[PDB]
Design a protein around this ligand. Structure first.
Ligand code: B12
Ligand code: B12
Ligand code: B12
Ligand code: B12
Lengths: 197, 200, 197, 201
């Protein structure tokens, strides 16, 4: 199968529970596109199509869970391969109540690929606890990924100010006005995070 | 240093030294092998993280960091156990149960015995779980519960007929609640494949 | 299949020309041991056994070549998946006359995994040319890997002293007295190269 | 745009140590033209420009090394992506004394793309050792790539004849007379190698 058909192939493999086939297809994508390219051209398009199929009522949450778990495992492999430099970390998580992790992990990965010690905490970190860890580790920045807008709507004005010296908010759930309200710097593009630091 | 590995790993995680944590875990693999490292290093460290949190010695951000690391290690082992062909067993946690390690352990113990255990991730709504089991023709569904409250919230018979065999375990579960929910109850993961193969 | 048998399995696969099997076994070792661990537990033991078997006369050069080429290809794959930060590079190569690449690639990999922009040049770089590139790119360091002692012995006293602001020499062909003679800093372990920098 | 237009950009990224940029540009070329087109119209032209610039004294050995190592890494990725089929292998190497790899790796790639199990040994394999491995693995063919002519001149008449059931020789260092002297089948076209083995399909 051609590169342009790897996305359809992967989604069909996952929807029939063929994890071995899915792993093979993803690895082919990695080899063809390289790491950034496989995320852009395979991981993200499959995740989005899973979401659309769910919105259309063609699949349920269990199929989305299966696909997201698979894709998380693949991104975690890449994250581990990028390595973790010493020095003051950037803490990467999602707002309280946000359980979608891929965006955060993508942010951490893009940072790690540029030599930044992005410490992915997992999703859904209470803000007092996040601030306390940032302070204790001397973190240079906190990065939050918000896929949904509702977890941000739940936060009080200024809630993200002073989590760390720099606080960045992105994801589809976030916009510049909400970032301003919460006291974060907004960034639309993952590729601009490493530059900003 | 086997006797010191657990303390070393926990300290590395709590200072954000992921490189050190990874090195120590690999040393645990060298000492104890794949199953052994789970029993002697992963689970003791997970439990000490939880206890330290319960005592107020660490916050949620530290616990998250450590749990994320340990989940990554267990996912590696789960993937190394392989995924055989044939009708899958779906493995997840009840609605409202966000803790994953027990479910991943169940999937691992199944896969190492040649059972195609598909780990979905945690916290799967039951109608959705039923629909996926149907779509994949799953022979069994396995749920891991660390907390009892998510189970208490579920209706009588909520787990019955998710597949022809349904198992519930984890410290949050007990035989009476399993019975109420329409699931079989088991405590030993080393017997779970055998229990599923052989008649109820 | 079992971790303790991956070395035996990989060597046997390579000696029978089973590259698909070898690739699968190496990937298993990567998953089990992690990026640095697979080099310590699988790649280096297999490389060394191949070399020793050749020195004992038990295998021919074609068999040795196949295995060494395969292992280099796997290390190059890992190297490319590491972070590559912006900023002044560290140039990594081998002395003039040293054709063996693995130690240099290992050095570059260890440095990239610690957030250092190590440029692996390939092996066997003439010193004037190496200095010129280091100067033009503003490299902070040059790192040389020597498996054989004879290429070092052929160099005049002080030959390595001004290749860059810091010059490190390691590999089993090097020792502290030779490093001193040649004007390089010696290090035995790659684990403290990044710290020293 | 043709792939050759990216050549200046790629080489300049490499020469300033911008590995990420060089890799990004090469991958764009792969996406736009695919592997065969990028190899013929970007990798080989850049390799040749690097070599000629070195011969002209315009770049030093360290810059040439960096560019050659990068291009080999990209070709090795493609070689591995083409996969390794089962079946009696074709051993692919270069003559004793030939250290240049790219032509051999291209031959292995073109064979693997057509479903032929081409085992790339690396360069510079002694002939009796190569013969021994070919016999032991039951190889259907040996393929040699020569960039330099002197390694071939060094070989005795008929040296290549019986390395395997078929023996193919190409690269700019080889020509038909020398192949005939050495007992190899002379071949120039990479894409025609698999067909020359007379296998099914
Ligand atoms: C997949 C998807 C989901 C998935 C999420 C996948 C998962 N579980 O992991 C699921 C199934 C959860 C889902 C359901 C819902 N989601 Co939805 N679905 C989508 C979809 C199709 C793709 C978006 C996505 O998840 N992309 C993955 C992320 C990583 O991409 P991203 O957020 O765009 O982030 C990019 C950048 O921002 C950047 N980035 C990410 N984080 C950060 C951080 C920083 C600092 C920086 C610099 C950059 C950065 O990287 C990413 C890739 O480049 C979109 C529609 C679309 N966009 O085509 C909606 C969409 C986002 N969903 C929507 C919403 C709100 C929902 C629902 C509430 C709707 C519903 N009930 O039907 C539910 C919520 C239920 C719940 N889960 O809580 C709506 C939002 C608009 C609205 N209606 O208000 C959307 C936009 C669809 C639409 N057009 O209406 N959804
Ligand atoms: C670690 C831990 C946590 C961690 C979990 C980290 C993680 N998992 O990523 C953290 C700190 C997050 C946590 C939080 C809380 N937890 Co807590 N904590 C624990 C602790 C110390 C250990 C839990 C554990 O061992 N997990 C590992 C799993 C795999 O162990 P397991 O379920 O026992 O499973 C074993 C077997 O059952 C078998 N198995 C597992 N699944 C299955 C499935 C099948 C089919 C089979 C056959 C076998 C099987 O395998 C396992 C190993 O042999 C215990 C106390 C203790 N010493 O046990 C509590 C405990 C579970 N926590 C408790 C509580 C209440 C909480 C909190 C609600 C407290 C709070 N107010 O916030 C929160 C949960 C909030 C939330 N939703 O996150 C209570 C639960 C009481 C109850 N449900 O009746 C406990 C018992 C402590 C106590 N005595 O009060 N906790
Ligand atoms: C593998 C091997 C080969 C292979 C090499 C395959 C390949 N493509 O790499 C083959 C068979 C080709 C080979 C050939 C020869 N080799 Co040989 N072979 C070895 C062997 C078994 C292992 C070498 C090795 O470990 N390489 C891997 C590198 C990475 O390990 P390393 O240099 O020890 O580096 C470690 C650390 O120093 C650190 N590190 C590496 N670089 C750097 C740099 C810095 C800055 C730092 C901080 C750290 C660091 O990382 C590594 C961690 O383990 C050894 C004996 C042995 N058991 O060690 C000999 C040995 C190196 N070979 C030797 C010889 C003599 C030869 C030949 C000259 C033999 C001959 N023809 O007569 C030829 C060379 C010509 C040739 N190309 O054929 C000698 C060299 C002795 C000396 N004083 O130089 C040895 C020691 C054997 C002996 N005689 O005892 N060899
Ligand atoms: C690039 C190059 C280099 C690079 C190579 C980098 C690298 N890692 O590959 C560098 C700068 C390192 C180099 C070094 C030298 N080179 Co130079 N260089 C060239 C150059 C510019 C191009 C070579 C090339 O195209 N290689 C890529 C391969 C794939 O191309 P190809 O062999 O033509 O193969 C084609 C087909 O035959 C097919 N193919 C290849 N193999 C096979 C096999 C089979 C079976 C089939 C079917 C097809 C096939 O694929 C290709 C498609 O176009 C040429 C001049 C020119 N413009 O052609 C010289 C040239 C080859 N170099 C030459 C020389 C002399 C040298 C040096 C000896 C210079 C010196 N040091 O003094 C050194 C070699 C040092 C040593 N080995 O010890 C001479 C060789 C003359 C001769 N042998 O009679 C040439 C011809 C230049 C000249 N006119 O003087 N060189």
């Amino acid at each position: 199968v051609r590169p342009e058909d790897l996305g359809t192939g992967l989604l069909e493999a996952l929807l029939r529970g063929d994890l071995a086939g899915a792993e093979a297809l993803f690895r082919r994508g990695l080899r063809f596109w390289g790491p950034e390219g496989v995320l852009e051209h395979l991981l993200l398009p499959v995740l989005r199509e899973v979401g659309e199929a769910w919105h259309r009522g063609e699949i349920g949450v269990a199929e989305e869970h299966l696909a997201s778990t698979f894709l998380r495992a693949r991104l975690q492999e890449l994250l581990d391969l990028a390595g973790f430099p010493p020095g003051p970390p950037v803490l990467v998580t999602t707002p309280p109540g946000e359980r979608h992790e891929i965006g955060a992990m993508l942010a951490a990965y893009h940072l790690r690929r540029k030599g930044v010690p992005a410490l992915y905490l997992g999703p859904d970190t209470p803000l007092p606890d996040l601030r306390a860890l940032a302070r204790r580790l001397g973190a240079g920045a906190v990065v939050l990924s918000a896929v949904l807008s509702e977890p941000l709507r739940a936060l009080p004005d200024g809630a993200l100010k002073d989590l760390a010296p720099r606080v960045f908010l992105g994801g589809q759930g976030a916009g510049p006005e909400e970032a301003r309200r919460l006291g974060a710097e907004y960034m639309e593009d993952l590729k601009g995070l490493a530059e900003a630091l």
